[PDB]
Subunit: 485 residues, 3 copies
């Protein structure tokens, strides 16, 4: 077969199961949902709420970017300098690790999610609680032999559509649903082993270096935010379709680093060379080839993507200021989490030329709160968000706070088993407490008035659920929330 | 679909059940002759080299007669209402509110050596990792769990069996009788165990102060329990024939009503409880039949729910006859239930003629113990009544339960081992009977020196040819160990 | 079907999957292997070191001697004399065991190794760190019942060819490759239950009783060899094709002893009687019938085999010396591990008559470690070997030292995943901390000079390497190996 499907080559028939039609989200009251209330994404024909296109269609629209012409590399000379700085920096900061055994590679894998090609099994189905058996034991078995023999395996990605809460517009307007990349089990265990050591280190380092993954918001926010705060100029950028705009060239460079700084370089070189080679994506009707943009199924995926964000940010910064990348790194503080950034700096940076330099790499930043570039840069770290918490400073120090609407949305809905109609209500949801408490916390940070507003809504539910809830005093949470513990 | 009848009951579908077992677990302990009138394992079907008899399938038909017999009468509505509230209060006051059971804890609570039942009919340990169910029993449970959380309903499929146990020779050589077993679907097994395990646990904890003794130790809780009965003048053991099959779903619901209301998840437990009591589906080889009535004895909860009904049926009779409100009867009586097994102790001056009627009128079948005839007798001693198949005995040291010598003797003549076709076949040394062997001494020593010494005869020999050897204890020495423990 | 495979009757169709065309060995340097260097054994039609006969054919070659006319029985009057003596000695040494549970037996098994007939799954594929489930589970259950019930089962042995390093000739001359019998899990656990107590007894008296199975060369060596040194004359006796040349009649004699010292003898009788009954072997296309020779699959067999050995040897000595076997055995110290023997004795033994006896039994000693015989004996314990170690006569006592040439190899080759070409290099190995150490300590005992040339090789084998380890001093490590712990 061959084969132009959604702008991209065809290679084979798809072994993809048909796109999930049911959602995990459940309204907690039966009340008339407030106007403009976020909602579970489009569900398909079956979705009673609206009459939108096929899920198969929605997926096509999502593939569009991955065939849009790639932008230009950063000037080769500068790129070399940044890769090497980022490397050199890590070399000095990252602690050499023990290699990961098949056991720990398999131990690490989320057993609640799908094995993907070809068994498309929920991983738990084949897990002893130590190693993998049966169908998946054997895929893993072989994926391990192959990794140890430094031999190559084409990975097969299975596409999906993220079930999440979205603005009503995404539903009753132009229907949009966000694309996923379900890795296969073989590939997962291979990259697990390959770059699980390196990733680990990076998480232990997540306060000292700019890749933030593994960072505790409450526990690390104050310090990380105080750090950015030492710097004169702050900025946000709001990349849209970051993932599908990545150049594989750059990804190779991030991979170059990851390999170098992983304990089995010889064997990593393969998995990474594998992970980056024109990628096969099963959309159901066909598997297709995607040569560009980020291939996002793998354990290490988000770190490698962060690593590119770093590279890309520096590349422009250095071009613009024209200062040696390591210098900029000592006149700057960075936070990265995939597409998620906060760039702080003492260097006088030209916001026009910076915007121009990235849009030239093919990126699509925007003005974080007014949707327009050049990217403004304020004298105040307050008003940028990171991890959808907003940066805030009082007389005690800095902290990331979740905003009103998000905490509103978290009360209105709750996880549950899969179902087709999201306004349905399950019985007395028992995993409420441990979360419901945190909600209590995060609202304290908005003070008294609002906290009362939540204090009640909390009482309302939790009573008619498990046992009773202690509703602590506003000032008593603030201390548990800000300080501790 | 079908319908149709088998064993006088509508046919709902074809049977997936495997064929009924033709073997037993009881290997004669020794190669000698069996003493005359000796108990022997129940009939093995076609292939029993002991007697010519019908197909096991036939024995099943016999066993299935009662579930199509007309039900007895509901106890006067008012008293029913009255007794259920009184029983609900007792439990409301006596049960430490337990918290909801998770998937994991329910899965953990299952006896993994019994069958999984329909569909796969597999020994449960087979898809068991040590904590979860994988593969086949994985799918069925994980599906069964989802249906629960969501409050959707399932149709339980039960699988029939015939109890393999020692029976009085007469049930083999005269008219053949082997007892009906129900076996729940792992689907229901897990579902009904979330809904009702917290309750069964609660009840379990509360069993020295509550008449439902499911979970008791005869050694530890026996003395207390029995000494508790003796505070009451009159005693009756008033024992039932065909208990399970006489049950009225109507009452069984009231039983269920209570457990649901008393569960950490009423909303969820209700959907599961309705499912159990719904006209039941029993896989009997060739067909699955609709059983509208009696008790659906598959699931975990079952035996608690069963006793709960027995509570409700005894109370109704007492209130119907004495005409004292159910809280006063219960403050004037000590009850002991376990499914069908029962002691009833009360100071109230109950009319035994009038009582039996009410019971029979509810369609129950009480007989004068294994002494034959009445009206049921009442006595002013507790001595002689028995419970969980031990004799209730009282001495200078308090009350206790004493498995009787006839009963001890058989245990000497039979030992459990793998399934096989000939009951008179003997094993080797069988190197795992020290646990069992010890108990026998204990049991014996409570019958005075004469006896224990002649049980010291046998427990000696059968210790020679065995895995290890220890010396036989002194009487007074072991009796103490037996009476006050440990 | 019917009815002749390499000289032996057909009984049924085989179910054995095909033979491994692959090796587990991998080269450590790409450097061209020295002249006359051992290599993994031949791997058939896809093997590239030569074009030779089918593995099928090679195995037929291995099966030839099972059909050979058996040798003769020792004189009845000498046979019982010994056997009754051996048992009485065990009886005077062995601490009585308590019966092995299913639970215990299921634990014993080498979990990393094929299930045999009929699933042919590696055991690990079905275990829970706990018990066998699924397939093997059921198999394990059934057999256990047939045990307790004292009913019988027909073992179904699977045939294979040992992947090992061999003298290069055995690839480029007359291709040979050693036969293995895979037992079936049923017989496995069944024999484990029946005969595990006995083997355990043997384990814990392997210094006082000639059957050294389970011994530690390092911990137990210095005192086993010390007992040997207490005697005037010592002898290699080196046997060709032990297992093939065996006589079931004697295997039954050792069977009888074993069964006599088992906690549950009646249960054990059966298992033995099966083990010893004409063995059914699964050779791929067909199952055939092996009436003679030692059937080697299950647990037990190695102790069974040594026990036979014990008998055969003790026979020759009584045969020749004319002396009551109690006196022989009290003017002598034996060491048997399978076919590996060492016989120390004070009795003047007529070497001509003695050898003759063994051959008459249908045995096949070669010359100690030279060519042609009459077998020969020395006045010194040095020069003899056992468990592939040269016995050494040191001021600190006696020991086992792995020879120079054996070391060179363990440095030349590394075990890895199964592959097609033995000559490839295992891309930047990890697992050597334990194995590297041991060989560094092996070389310790060969003097200060030899240790140096080794140290260096160890180190460039620690070049592209998982752990950046020290070379400890010679003196230090030599202290470490000899003395322990």
């Amino acid at each position: 077969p061959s084969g132009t499907y959604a702008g991209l080559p065809i290679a084979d028939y798809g072994d993809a199961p048909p796109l999930s039609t049911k959602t995990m989200f459940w309204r907690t009251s039966p009340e008339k949902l407030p106007p403009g209330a976020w909602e579970p994404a489009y569900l398909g024909s079956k979705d009673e709420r609206v009459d939108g296109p096929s899920l198969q269609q929605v997926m096509r629209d999502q593939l569009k970017p991955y065939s849009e012409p790639r932008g230009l590399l950063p000037p080769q000379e500068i790129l070399d300098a940044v890769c090497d700085a980022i490397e050199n920096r890590l070399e000095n900061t990252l602690e050499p690790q023990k290699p990961w055994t098949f056991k720990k590679a398999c131990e690490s894998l989320d057993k609640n999610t799908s094995s993907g090609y070809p068994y498309h099994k929920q991983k738990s189905k084949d897990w002893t609680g130590s190693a993998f058996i049966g169908d998946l034991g054997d895929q893993a078995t072989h994926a391990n032999n192959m990794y140890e023999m430094g031999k190559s395996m084409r990975p097969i990605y299975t596409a999906a559509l993220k079930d999440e809460l979205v603005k009503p517009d995404k539903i009753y307007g132009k229907i949009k649903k966000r694309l996923l990349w379900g890795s296969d089990l073989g590939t997962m265990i291979r990259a697990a082993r390959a770059f699980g050591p390196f990733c680990d280190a990076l998480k232990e380092t997540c306060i000292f270096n700019p890749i933030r993954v593994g960072m505790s918001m409450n526990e690390d926010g104050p310090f990380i935010f105080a750090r950015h705060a030492n710097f004169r100029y702050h900025m946000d950028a709001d990349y849209t379709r970051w993932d599908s705009t990545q150049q594989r060239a750059i990804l190779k460079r991030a991979g170059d680093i990851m390999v170098r700084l992983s304990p089995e370089p010889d064997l990593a070189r393969v998995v990474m060379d594998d992970l980056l080679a024109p990628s096969l994506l099963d959309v159901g009707d066909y598997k297709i080839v995607v040569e560009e943009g980020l291939p996002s199924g793998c354990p290490c995926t988000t770190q490698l993507n962060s690593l590119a964000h770093w590279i890309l940010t520096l590349c422009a910064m250095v071009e613009v200021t024209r200062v040696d990348p390591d210098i900029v790194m000592q006149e700057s503080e960075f936070s990265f989490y995939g597409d998620d950034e906060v760039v702080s700096t003492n260097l006088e940076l030209d916001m026009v030329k910076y915007t121009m330099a990235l849009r030239r790499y093919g990126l699509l930043p925007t003005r974080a709160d007014k949707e327009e570039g050049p990217l403004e840069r304020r004298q105040t770290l307050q008003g940028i968000s990171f991890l959808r918490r907003a940066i805030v400073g009082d007389q005690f120090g800095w902290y990331g706070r979740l905003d009103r609407a998000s905490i509103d949305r978290q009360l209105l809905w709750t996880k549950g088993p899969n179902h087709q109609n999201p306004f349905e209500t399950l019985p007395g949801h028992a995993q409420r407490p441990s979360q419901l408490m945190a909600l209590l916390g995060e609202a304290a940070m908005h003070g008294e008035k609002y906290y009362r507003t939540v204090a009640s809504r909390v009482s309302k539910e939790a009573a008619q659920s498990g046992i009773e809830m202690v509703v602590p005093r506003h000032r008593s949470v603030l201390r548990w929330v800000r300080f501790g513990t």
